[PDB]
Amino acid sequence: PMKNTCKLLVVADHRFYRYMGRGEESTTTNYLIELIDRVDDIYRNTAWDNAGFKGYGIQIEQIRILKSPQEVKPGEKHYNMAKSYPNEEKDAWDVKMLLEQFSFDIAEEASKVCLAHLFTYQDFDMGTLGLAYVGSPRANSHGGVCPKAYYSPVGKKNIYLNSGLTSTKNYGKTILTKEADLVTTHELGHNFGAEHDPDGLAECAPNEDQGGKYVMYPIAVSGDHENNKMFSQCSKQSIYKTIESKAQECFQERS
Numbered sequence: 001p002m003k004n005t006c007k008l009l010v011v012a013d014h015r016f017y018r019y020m021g022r023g024e025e026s027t028t029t030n031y032l033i034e035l036i037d038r039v040d041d042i043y044r045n046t047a048w049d050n051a052g053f054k055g056y057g058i059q060i061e062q063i064r065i066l067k068s069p070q071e072v073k074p075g076e077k078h079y080n081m082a083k084s085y086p087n088e089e090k091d092a093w094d095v096k097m098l099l100e101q102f103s104f105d106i107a108e109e110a111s112k113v114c115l116a117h118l119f120t121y122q123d124f125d126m127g128t129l130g131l132a133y134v135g136s137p138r139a140n141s142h143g144g145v146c147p148k149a150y151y152s153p154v155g156k157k158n159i160y161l162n163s164g165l166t167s168t169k170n171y172g173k174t175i176l177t178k179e180a181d182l183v184t185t186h187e188l189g190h191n192f193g194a195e196h197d198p199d200g201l202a203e204c205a206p207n208e209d210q211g212g213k214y215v216m217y218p219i220a221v222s223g224d225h226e227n228n229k230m231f232s233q234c235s236k237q238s239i240y241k242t243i244e245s246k247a248q249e250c251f252q253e254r255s
């Protein structure tokens with residue numbers, strides 16, 4: 001019961017620093033402190049087993065604010081580089097490659113925490129807001145909560161897929177504060193072991209009259225409905241199993 005907190009590495013790239021933090025370290029830091037805290041309220045108050053398996057959440061261990069782009073040599077790349085990859089003409093990276101790059105460059109630091117999350121400000125194609133590796137109760141699981149090394153031929157080092165990312169820009173504008181909270185909650189949800197909520201008899205995708213959809217629905221919920229900020233029964237079952245298996249592994253006490 002004491003090891004109930006997933007310690008985070010939170011990173012804000014130069015884009016987030018500039019457009020969301022107004023180029024100020026204080027504003028950027030406070031934004032991300034407050035957002036993670038709001039997301040934590042959702043997590044801590046969720047009873048994963050619909051009883052007393054409550055009190056599990058997230059807490060920032062380290063915050064890194066990248067104030068300027070990462071100077072890069074020819075043919076070389078970095079998640080914090082000024083240009084988007086692989087298509088320099090696009091407003092955004094390709095989201096999958098960005099998450100992959102982030103994990104590679106931040107490997108050393110990620111091995112020290114339960115999860116690493118990247119906050120950026122770029123307009124991913126076709127309406128995408130965030131992405132994350134799915135966690136699992138499986139011992140040899142490679143993804144989600146807890147740093148489970150994955151050798152990387154090319155970097156002579158271990159890489160950890162205990163990561164996810166959130167962008168606060170979509171369709172040419174800054175998304176709402178309540179929407180940003182839902183994106184991170186959703187991505188961290190995957191890291192905690194949840195898959196997407198399915199439609200049908202499973203009770204995991206209610207109609208508007210029944211409170212609306214839950215946070216792990218694949219199509220971004222608005223946040224206007226009661227169930228939008230909460231986890232469905234389908235997510236609870238998946239996450240419950242993951243937490244009970246990995247909590248002793250890398251979770252720590254709340255600070």
Ligand SMILES: CC(C)C[C@H](CC(=O)NO)C(=O)N[C@H](C(=O)N[C@@H](C)C(=O)NCCN)C(C)(C)C
Nearest residue numbers: 126127128129130131132183186217218219220
């Ligand atoms: C926080 C959200 C739920 C994350 C997912 C991506 C995901 O599953 N990451 O774990 C997303 O970006 N969903 C997009 C999404 O629902 N975006 C909305 C804003 C959208 O474009 N709706 C369509 C408007 N005509 C997709 C990829 C489905 C377009």
Ligand SMILES: [Zn+2]
Nearest residue numbers: 186190196218
């Ligand atoms: Zn998702």
